[model samples]
Target: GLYVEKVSGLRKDFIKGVDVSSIIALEESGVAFYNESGKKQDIFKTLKEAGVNYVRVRIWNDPYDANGNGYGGGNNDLEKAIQIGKRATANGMKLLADFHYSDFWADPAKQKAPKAWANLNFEDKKTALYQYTKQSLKAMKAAGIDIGMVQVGNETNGGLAGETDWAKMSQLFNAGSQAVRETDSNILVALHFTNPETSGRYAWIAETLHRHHVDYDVFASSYYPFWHGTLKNLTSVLTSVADTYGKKVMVAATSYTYTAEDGDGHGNTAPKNGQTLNNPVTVQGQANAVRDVIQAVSDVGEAGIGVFYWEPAWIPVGPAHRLEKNKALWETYGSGWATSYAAEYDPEDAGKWFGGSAVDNQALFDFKGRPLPSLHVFQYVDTGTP
Candidate 1:
């Protein structure tokens, strides 16, 4: 069980996890992992071997466009997410189920309502949220995957369920939050926020949840130094939040590129969003960044529960699959919309591909899908039983 109050040092049962949200997509595309000697390996089993005892997998309500064409971000509909969850639990890893509350990606920038819920009235939307959340948990339970933790919504800093109104957002959160409690009162609930450097924003969210009498257990933050801030910035904010909220804190998502050089031509290999590059991208640099972040969380004391590396497994779309997969993901979401959501990165090599996945370079694996030495850093901090 997750302790919600303030305490000292890192929790001995702290989570050391990785979000493999794109597992379904990669496996479906025939991607595979290898050892230094080129022997094939099972990703989940390999991560467990590398001392990753927790796994985070995100769920989208309906990851397909109106015509039923799949949006290739793992097409993380419930069924696929459940299959991934089963694999995680079977590997003896605890699970954190993240509900994006949208048909596609849900983050600070975009929170598009799922196509199925777009037409519902406000009150009806609240009902929809509760029912949807409950059903999703029930399905996971039926599959015998005991979700150790639940995220009501992904990166829900500004609003929730795409509803920006403050009061309505509270109602929306209460509905979803209550659903998790009702499904299994013991499951630890988490509220994830991005841009971890901002302490005031989380203070506001805490006040709002308090005002609405909403129940939750963990405060999760996504800390991508390239998009969020530096270790110093992260430490100060974590100290502020851990002291201010008296709730358990966890780095729900964090990662660094193993190669500062982008194999894809997206030019994102450089830092942006007010982030100045402090560490060069190398396996050693990534290991240091990951270890430093974990140490920062530990320094926050018991309120700081653990850190989860985001999409450590999202390797590149094979040179061959780049065009084929992107074309598939782009056309299915209706070109007009996918034009914006098209692969955010491109392969470093020109292979007649249109665009590429932005996360490949940051993955714990290289383009060839061999686990990087940086992954072993998790072993140093993982307190979760294997």
Candidate 2:
């Protein structure tokens, strides 16, 4: 069971979103999600009923091996994103298309250029990025997806498209942003970064983006409570960015553990050896963590827009006790965080550390794919449940 104190002054149009980029893969792997009454349901419909107003899906470029085996992590190429976007739109939720601009996962540590762009000069690389974004967006529009926002890059704190230089990174960012503007006037262009816990990190980024003139609307950050610092710091840093840069702010990704148990045989990202647990490991605590994140962003006033829960439905495809069985499914369906096929593109990380859902325990569903009481936290945050 879960109970959340109402978030005072929460925006009526506040975006309560979830990144279920893995949904297609999870479903292909035989995973089924259920409602509170236990009937199998479309995950998007389930989410909309639970008050989720937006869906964030990540798109990676060519996440596959030469053999055409998917590189897992949802194998989120443009076609996959279209499938996800259409479903989210059909469910009455707006879509946030997050582009990784890499052949595999793009984060602070790694932002490898897509294989097609690996040999291109910086200018050509920028052109390719722009074209890719523009073409992909057009396809999404053709599919009748209601895209509300487009993240130029995923967690691009230090680099993007294999360029570490801020000037060059800003160029790449601008290229993507330009494509977004060309595709849809109303759709917001967002630049995503992580590690807000570091002192002066976001401030420095905001200043750099200003100096470089990276065109984007939302200044989004990932805020996993265990790794990121306090909610107060989250608000303070985001507020500074909003006030200083005159841009909207949001938590691009955030989630909490409802249990310490690993559901999919693969080791989870949290409830691990060293991460701090800010709240009790229960459904109620999970609800509180999500509520607090929304509150933190809402505290940013008109500049604050929304919060998105990361992979909240990436539950286990099979029992953890049956490791081999689950592994087969993960490999075949690209259900896990990384498949062995990803080694071709991301050898150091996905090659060495490839497996099942690393955040299954943090999902707003149990291992059996039944919605947790915490799923209601999205609605409960606006009005407290008695």
Candidate 3:
């Protein structure tokens, strides 16, 4: 059975004591799969034990099917958002509400308006944006969830809702910010970008925000070394954004999930037969990933704030697979299959997912509540504060 603790008991210090003073947030959208996983409780408690101070949950307006079973993609709908928000509160972690403004998913490639928002035009859309921001935030506050940060959109790289124009996007973002300010002025507003490959992308985004008379208090970027670039490359680019833009940059979303909880991956996401990054990787690999980002950003001499693991606690909530979303994970040696996260961009045959699970997989603690090696790489670890 899962140990359910009240939010008041959120932090559990290990090895004498641990602290969240230096950390700004613990990025946790990925671990927030909106279904029943046997290990959810363990995951949540374990995350808190790992010194997570802040949690971010994305909210969708209405993600109910007619029968409401949910078209699943972690169901991250409003209901799930509220549940996670409550849990985050209970865990004593600050909450960040990410408003996708979409019913299903919002991203650079797609920002489909919610079913309700689809028909609105330019003027109506603008008004709707204002009202939506105010109303949604008001609901979140009413839900008794304390939000420390709010993002108007998850990643506003492409466009948002019905506002495809840059100026329109700015207007919408400002309106959203105003909505949050109205609710709780203390809560910071964030402008999130994809795991940027270059500083110029962030510069373009910052310039756009300035043009619209909008400002993001926190400059956040998603940093996945495998996806974005090498550790050095990520830092160089992030340094530019942090120093040039002059904002505390958070690697708001990062992850390195092992194909299996055990270090011996099934090799479904492996690079080649018996040859893969995770093939012989240690838990340190995952820990180092987080450490590297933290170090890289710090190496640049900016206020390297904190990082949130994309989805720190997602255990397979299995039922089936989809054409668009194949839940089945084939082995790296192409020998076996199981339900796990699918590969992105890289080919399964080449074994890209091999890395002995993410360094952070053990970066925190195991489900059994044991500290793994990756924890050593965290600069804050073992030094009496983290």
Q: Which candidate gets the maximum lDDT versus the true structure?
A: 2
Which one is best on TM-score? 2
Candidate 2 steric clashes: 0
**Cα lDDT tens digits for candidate 3, 65-94:** 444433233445555566667766787777
Q: In model 2, what is the error at residue 44, expressed in angstroms?
A: 0.7
Between prediction 1 and prediction 2, the one with superior TM-score is 2
The segments of candidate 1 whose C-alpha lies over 4 angstroms from its true place after superposition are 1-11, 264-274, 320-355, 381-386
Each model's backbone clash number: 5, 0, 25
- In angstroms, give how far residue 313 of model 2 lies from its true place: 0.8
- Is candidate 2 or 3 superior in lDDT? 2
Output the lDDT of residue 156, model 3.
75
| Higher-ranked by lDDT: 1 or 3 | 1
Off-target runs (Cα >4 Å) in candidate 2 are none
Better of 1 and 2 by lDDT: 2
* lDDT for model 2: 0.93
- Of the pair 1 and 3, which is ahead by TM-score? 1
